[PDB]
Design a protein around this ligand. Structure first.
Ligand SMILES: [Cl-]
Ligand SMILES: [Cl-]
Ligand SMILES: [Cl-]
Ligand SMILES: [Cl-]
Ligand SMILES: [Cl-]
Ligand SMILES: [Cl-]
Ligand SMILES: [Cl-]
Ligand SMILES: [Cl-]
Ligand SMILES: [Cl-]
Ligand SMILES: [Cl-]
Ligand SMILES: [Cl-]
Ligand SMILES: [Cl-]
Ligand SMILES: [Cl-]
Ligand SMILES: [Cl-]
Ligand SMILES: [Cl-]
Ligand SMILES: [Cl-]
Ligand SMILES: [Cl-]
Ligand SMILES: [Cl-]
Ligand SMILES: [Cl-]
Ligand SMILES: [Cl-]
Ligand SMILES: [Cl-]
Ligand SMILES: [Cl-]
Ligand SMILES: [Cl-]
Ligand SMILES: [Cl-]
Ligand SMILES: [Cl-]
Ligand SMILES: [Cl-]
Ligand SMILES: [Cl-]
Ligand SMILES: [Cl-]
Ligand SMILES: [Cl-]
Ligand SMILES: [Cl-]
Ligand SMILES: [Cl-]
Ligand SMILES: [Cl-]
Ligand SMILES: [Cl-]
Ligand SMILES: [Cl-]
Ligand SMILES: [Cl-]
Ligand SMILES: [Cl-]
Ligand SMILES: [Cl-]
Ligand SMILES: [Cl-]
Ligand SMILES: [Cl-]
Ligand SMILES: [Cl-]
Ligand SMILES: [Cl-]
Ligand SMILES: [Fe+2]
Ligand SMILES: [Fe+2]
Ligand SMILES: [Fe+2]
Ligand SMILES: [Fe+2]
Ligand SMILES: [Fe+2]
Ligand SMILES: [Fe+2]
Ligand SMILES: [Fe+2]
Ligand SMILES: [Fe+2]
Ligand SMILES: [Fe+2]
Ligand SMILES: [Mg+2]
Ligand SMILES: [Mg+2]
Ligand SMILES: [Mg+2]
Ligand SMILES: [Mg+2]
Ligand SMILES: [Mg+2]
Ligand SMILES: [Mg+2]
Ligand SMILES: [Mg+2]
Ligand SMILES: [Mg+2]
Ligand SMILES: [Mg+2]
Ligand SMILES: [Mg+2]
Ligand SMILES: [Mg+2]
Ligand SMILES: [Mg+2]
Ligand SMILES: [Mg+2]
Ligand SMILES: [Mg+2]
Ligand SMILES: [Mg+2]
Ligand SMILES: [Mg+2]
Ligand SMILES: [Mg+2]
Ligand SMILES: [Mg+2]
Ligand SMILES: [Mg+2]
Ligand SMILES: [Mg+2]
Ligand SMILES: [Mg+2]
Ligand SMILES: [Mg+2]
Ligand SMILES: [Mg+2]
Ligand SMILES: [Mg+2]
Ligand SMILES: [Mg+2]
Ligand SMILES: [Mg+2]
Ligand SMILES: [Mg+2]
Ligand SMILES: [Mg+2]
Ligand SMILES: [Mg+2]
Ligand SMILES: [Mg+2]
Ligand SMILES: [Mg+2]
Ligand SMILES: [Mg+2]
Ligand SMILES: [Mg+2]
Lengths: 174, 174, 174, 174
């Protein structure tokens, strides 16, 4: 084994690799949403830039797992990054609903990894997840939920003026 | 009696304690409104922060009565702070209507205390109410009335776009 | 359930509401201590301001639980804030002893909530308590214990000069 | 009558002259206390300077009544300023007790003048007293009461160390 390895279970090492892949998958889905809202026949540029920023965040999340793996003496093993589930995202409401589900999927994987780390008595991995992932996850889920509530209030999907107003007032001006 | 006490009637001392409690009650009601508008299924954050700020203002009002009591040689006597009348506040219009009524209730108590102070020939207490409470009360009542007029103009409760616009333009961006 | 809710047990939601109430109760007790030490026949103004500051801290603690509740998709439910156990607090030693007991009561409730969160496998709630509450609690308990030791050294309750000196040197000049 | 005179009763004019004299009397008493604490066999210089400052404040109070009289078209009429009741003031506790009584005597005269102004339906004079005199009076009475409580706590009159400590910590370093 690696000269640095201590209290790091093979199962946790493998699960970290799977989590890395999921972060990259999430990044790619957000990239797709960016490209969709940038289309000339969609043209909601603040929404597009919101998703582009989140795509970058998720890739940073992935890189943090790579660094973590090496710090513990595990070995990064990469797999294909699967393309997103859709090629087009409907409108801001449909995209935000998909984002909420994606964030909850990522959250569940993080919680499952915490359970595994707990089972294998790995407090360093528990701390890493709690300090770097779990709270930012709850914050993102809350933000997207708040957005969905406002999109519904604004009459999405039917109310185009509502969708226009959301892009101008609810997401940061880019 | 207290060595500082002069021209301070027992009835006024007691009424100041009751007014202190009412300020704390008002604070707590505004706290509840803050928490409601912060819910993910309500998500009107500028409205939420408006009510949070008012909750802090009312607690400051209460503390000013505590200080006043001691300055005159009266004794602060606290009672339970009753929970607010509602657990959920409907929407921005319903909440603002409740706020208007609350501010008028507080105003009536201040006016009643002024009547008592006048009856007991206590010009210091009259001045305190006039200089620190009565005008700020009229200003807050006017502000909330103006808000209600605009919420009705915007089609509340039915018009969700109107409610969204109020939160963006009528209350301070937080 | 709330669209944001994930891995949040009803028992934990309820316990967070109870903890919120306890924070408000603690705030109110400290408010009472402030008013007592501000009396003309007590007149220990640095001690008074110490308790006023702690009253504000506890209310901030309460507000942080409200925000937490909403972030997780729980619902804030408020109850009456009970008045403090005493109307007068004796002297600086008696008040500090009551403060120590209060801080230990709050600490026990936080520890009990951590046990519940652990039982329900909620690492986000565990992290929240550990990162935002448990250490600041230990620090406050240590500070108050240190104060009590010094008040006893200074000859409280009998030694009025000792009590005067504590207010001038041990608590921050306000 | 004076070309400016309007709604100013002769009784109020006379009472303003009497109040002016009382302010000058209070100033002179505080001057005497200053000189006493400046004695080489008393030598409490921060206490001395406290009383000197208050002597100046009272003379400013007197001058404000002179200005007021002329603003309303009344005529300033001066009488002898009687010497203080004592030639020596015992110690810090005795002096502060005399100061408390003096401030309450001045306060009673201000309250009596407010009653007269009310009886003669003079809202300008009522406002003047409320805005310029009554609250600063309550503040000074509270401050002196707080001092007396602390002097007693410090073991005055017998405890010379207590008296020394009061001069160093309770009154401003001059
Ligand atoms: Cl290992
Ligand atoms: Cl181990
Ligand atoms: Cl692997
Ligand atoms: Cl496959
Ligand atoms: Cl999808
Ligand atoms: Cl598709
Ligand atoms: Cl998903
Ligand atoms: Cl985090
Ligand atoms: Cl939003
Ligand atoms: Cl609509
Ligand atoms: Cl705008
Ligand atoms: Cl009285
Ligand atoms: Cl009177
Ligand atoms: Cl009462
Ligand atoms: Cl009741
Ligand atoms: Cl109501
Ligand atoms: Cl309700
Ligand atoms: Cl009401
Ligand atoms: Cl006002
Ligand atoms: Cl408005
Ligand atoms: Cl409408
Ligand atoms: Cl859940
Ligand atoms: Cl789970
Ligand atoms: Cl509950
Ligand atoms: Cl009960
Ligand atoms: Cl107690
Ligand atoms: Cl009691
Ligand atoms: Cl307790
Ligand atoms: Cl902490
Ligand atoms: Cl200490
Ligand atoms: Cl001792
Ligand atoms: Cl006239
Ligand atoms: Cl007239
Ligand atoms: Cl005259
Ligand atoms: Cl004579
Ligand atoms: Cl005398
Ligand atoms: Cl004499
Ligand atoms: Cl006198
Ligand atoms: Cl004043
Ligand atoms: Cl003092
Ligand atoms: Cl003594
Ligand atoms: Fe992520
Ligand atoms: Fe994410
Ligand atoms: Fe108020
Ligand atoms: Fe108010
Ligand atoms: Fe706009
Ligand atoms: Fe607390
Ligand atoms: Fe505390
Ligand atoms: Fe004066
Ligand atoms: Fe004076
Ligand atoms: Mg090797
Ligand atoms: Mg392996
Ligand atoms: Mg495929
Ligand atoms: Mg842990
Ligand atoms: Mg953290
Ligand atoms: Mg994030
Ligand atoms: Mg995320
Ligand atoms: Mg995340
Ligand atoms: Mg937000
Ligand atoms: Mg007494
Ligand atoms: Mg009474
Ligand atoms: Mg009830
Ligand atoms: Mg005013
Ligand atoms: Mg106001
Ligand atoms: Mg108000
Ligand atoms: Mg008010
Ligand atoms: Mg306005
Ligand atoms: Mg729903
Ligand atoms: Mg439940
Ligand atoms: Mg009870
Ligand atoms: Mg920490
Ligand atoms: Mg603390
Ligand atoms: Mg604490
Ligand atoms: Mg604490
Ligand atoms: Mg320390
Ligand atoms: Mg003429
Ligand atoms: Mg005349
Ligand atoms: Mg004579
Ligand atoms: Mg004033
Ligand atoms: Mg003054
Ligand atoms: Mg004065
Ligand atoms: Mg005065
Ligand atoms: Mg003071």
């Amino acid at each position: 084994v690696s000269q640095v390895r201590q209290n790091y279970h093979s199962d946790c090492e493998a699960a970290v690799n799977r989590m890395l892949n999921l972060e990259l998958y999430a990044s790619y889905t957000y990239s797709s949403m960016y490209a969709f809202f940038d289309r000339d026949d969609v043209a909601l540029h603040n929404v597009a830039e919101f998703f582009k920023e989140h795509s970058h965040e998720e890739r940073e999340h992935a890189e943090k797992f790579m660094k973590y793996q090496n710090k513990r003496g595990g070995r990064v093993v990469l797999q294909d990054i699967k393309k997103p589930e859709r090629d087009e995202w409907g409108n801001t409401l449909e995209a935000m609903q998909a984002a909420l589900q994606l964030e909850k999927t990522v959250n569940q994987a993080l919680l499952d990894l915490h359970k595994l780390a707990t089972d294998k008595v790995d407090p360093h991995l528990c701390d890493f997840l709690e300090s770097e992932y779990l709270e930012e996850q709850v914050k993102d889920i809350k933000r997207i939920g708040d957005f969905i509530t406002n999109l519904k209030r604004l009459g999405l999907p039917e109310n185009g003026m509502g969708e226009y107003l959301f892009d101008k007032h609810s997401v940061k001006e880019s």
